[PDB]
Each structure stands twice: as C-alpha cells, then as structure tokens.
Design a protein around this ligand. Structure first.
Ligand SMILES: O=c1[nH]nc(-c2ccc(Cl)c(C(F)(F)F)c2)o1
Ligand SMILES: *[C@@H]1O[C@H](CO)[C@@H](O)[C@H](O)[C@H]1NC(C)=O
Length: 348
C-alpha cells in the first residue's frame, strides 16, 4: 500500500532548500476528526559548504524535484490496526524534511541566500492548506516527528496552536509527539551541536518558541533546541519518546561502539542524565536501548517499558487528556543503566 499522496504547496513561495515547492503526503480518513502531522528528520546543514555537500548526496532532503507521488504510511502512520494500534483510523500527513534547519527556518532563497531555510513556514503553510481539506473539522492535531523532526515538534507545536487560535479554530486541540529529538548539550567523550546550532540559527534565520526566546534572549536561542530547556516553556501537551542511549546523541558525543572503565562510566552517566531530564515529563517513553527513532518503524509496537508498549502509552495519554489511570501509564522511563538491559530493545 502506497496510501499517502503527495500535494505540493499551492503557495510556491514556501520552498525546500533549492527553491522547489515544499509539500506534504496525505491519506484522508473521512470518519475521523484526528489528524497526525509527522515531521521527517535527517540532520541539518549550517553553512554553504556543508549544505552544498548535502545537496550532492542527500538531495531529497533539500528539494522536492525527485519526490515520488506516493509514500507508504508505516508505524504510527500506518492505517492498519495490526501495525498501528494507536491511531490507525486517523487522517495521516507526512511532511518531508527539505529545509535542513531542524524545522526552525524562516528565510527565502534570494540574491543574498543560496538556499532557502523555511522549515517553520512549511509547517504553518501545510496546516493552513489542510484546513481546507478537512482539518477545520478536527478535534485533535498531533504534531509528531522523529530525530530532527522530533526537535521540530518542540520548536513548532506551540506555534501551530497559536496559528489555529488566530485563524479562528480554538476547538482543535494541538499536541506534540517528539521522538528521538531530546538531546543533551553534554561533554563529548572525545562541529559540536551547540556551536553548529548557533551558526545554523544565523544561517537559517531560525526561530524558536516565544517563551523560550524570552528566557534565553538574543544570541542564546540555540538553547531552545535542547528539549530539557524548551519543554518547560511549552503550553501544548507533549509526549516525549527518547532512547536513553540514542545513537545520534552518542555520535555527536564522539562515541563509537570490551568497553573500558572510562567509556563505561561515560555511557552510564549519559543514561542517568537523560533519565534525570525526563523525571518531570509526565508523558514520556524512554527505553534503555542503543537505537534511534521509533515511531514510523513497522515494528514500533514491539518495545515495552515496564511491560507497556508505546502504542499503549500513547493511548493512555489520549485518555489522560479527556488523576492517574489504573493500569494505563503514561510516564515510562527505564531505570536500568546499560544498553539493552531492557530485553525488548530493537535487535538491529
Ligand atoms: O536527524 C538528527 N539526528 N540527530 C540529530 C540531532 C542531534 C543532536 C542535536 Cl543537539 C540536534 C538538534 F537538537 F539541535 F538538532 C539534532 O538530528
Ligand atoms: C505564501 O507564504 C509566505 C511565507 O509564509 C507568506 O508571506 C505569504 O503571505 C503566502 N502567500 C499566500 C498567497 O498565501
């Protein structure tokens, strides 16, 4: 099944990096007032030189010219209840990541700019075009995303909520699901995300949520790309999915996997730090695994924390947003200290 169909944005001034129109893939569900808008991930680029390289060998992530007419919805984007126990009947939207700006950019290609970085405007334009295609009737809009798209959820969920309020749709409940986008600005074990993001925000004209921007102020907006710093400033409900030993986190930390004491302590400390940042995140799913992304993989149902799968936790979250619920938990953070100490971790 290739059940999500491409729509290029009617406002062709909202573009991918190379000026081609951005777009979205849509699979409507007439019987449903639930809308899932998923933000693709795929790292970023932050200067002319590294964006040029990405354009050579990651061009679907900077351009729509080669996109296919359809995509198959998988995992949380699947319409089969066997694969997606959580929201199989929802209206499904996959928003391709073609702005290389962690979904933060608001800059057009111009005399001054070789590339457009319009991630934040792509999201707003998708939302506004979908209102004419049924989203106006929605009860819940779940903005989800993986990796850079998960960070994009944190950066954009409150803006989507404000956009819908200002457009006259205050009944649509906007919520966020951030998968594998909750990173730590920690010491490396041996370019670095904080500096690259600082440079990126400038290169992209990047924007961050207002309350977080007001806390950190000019020149320090890079702080708002880090979940534990931006999450407390957000008003929309956000469910956080994060492997405790995320492969992308380890990569930026210069860890490449007998492990000797120094690295053992480094890895154990990373897990404990991640766990600590989630202590006050009531809706979260954080298994003790070495992996990356979870929600659009076809076998996303297999992992469990304390005996509860992610589709179940998300269903429990839905119920909680109608006192904790008997046997239907929403805060699921592993406490064991080493990758794969949870037997349900992905096998690779
Ligand atoms: O697609 C991917 N894989 N790994 C990332 C990633 C890793 C670390 C950091 Cl700090 C960030 C952020 F938060 F600013 F973008 C993103 O993004
Ligand atoms: C197209 O998008 C741009 C950027 O968001 C916006 O300024 C402009 O008003 C939009 N045009 C139309 C006709 O919607």
């Amino acid at each position: 099944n290739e059940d999500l169909r491409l729509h290029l944005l009617l406002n062709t001034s909202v573009t991918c990096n190379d000026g081609s129109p951005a777009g979205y893939y849509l699979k409507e569900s007439r019987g449903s007032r639930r809308w899932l808008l998923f933000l693709e991930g795929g790292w970023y680029c932050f200067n002319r030189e590294n964006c040029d390289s990405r354009y050579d060998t990651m061009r679907r992530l900077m351009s729509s010219r080669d996109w296919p007419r359809t995509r198959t919805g998988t995992g949380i984007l699947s319409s089969q209840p066997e694969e997606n126990p959580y929201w199989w009947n929802a209206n499904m939207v996959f928003i391709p990541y073609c702005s290389s700006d962690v979904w933060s950019g608001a800059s057009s290609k111009s005399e001054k700019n070789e590339y457009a970085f319009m991630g934040a405007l792509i999201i707003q334009e998708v939302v506004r075009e979908l209102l004419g295609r049924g989203l106006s009737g929605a009860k819940v809009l779940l903005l989800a995303g993986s990796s850079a798209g998960g960070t994009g959820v944190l950066l954009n969920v409150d803006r989507v909520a404000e956009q819908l309020e200002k457009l006259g749709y205050p009944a649509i409940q906007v919520r966020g699901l951030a998968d594998s986008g909750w990173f730590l600005d920690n010491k490396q074990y041996r370019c670095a995300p904080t500096e690259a993001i600082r440079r990126g925000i400038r290169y992209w004209n990047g924007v961050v949520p207002e309350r977080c921007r007001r806390q950190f102020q000019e020149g320090e907006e890079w702080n708002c790309f880090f979940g534990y710093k931006v999450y407390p400033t957000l008003r929309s409900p956000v469910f956080v999915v994060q492997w405790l030993f995320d492969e992308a986190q380890l990569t930026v930390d210069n860890v490449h996997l007998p492990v000797q004491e120094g690295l053992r302590l480094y890895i154990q400390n990373l897990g404990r730090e991640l766990r600590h940042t989630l202590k006050d995140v009531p809706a979260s799913f954080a298994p003790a695994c070495l992996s990356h992304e979870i929600i659009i993989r076809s076998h996303w149902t297999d992992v469990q924390v304390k005996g509860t799968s992610l589709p179940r936790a998300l269903h429990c979250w839905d119920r909680s947003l109608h006192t904790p619920l008997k046997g239907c938990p929403v805060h699921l953070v592993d406490s064991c200290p080493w990758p794969h100490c949870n037997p349900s971790c992905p096998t690779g």
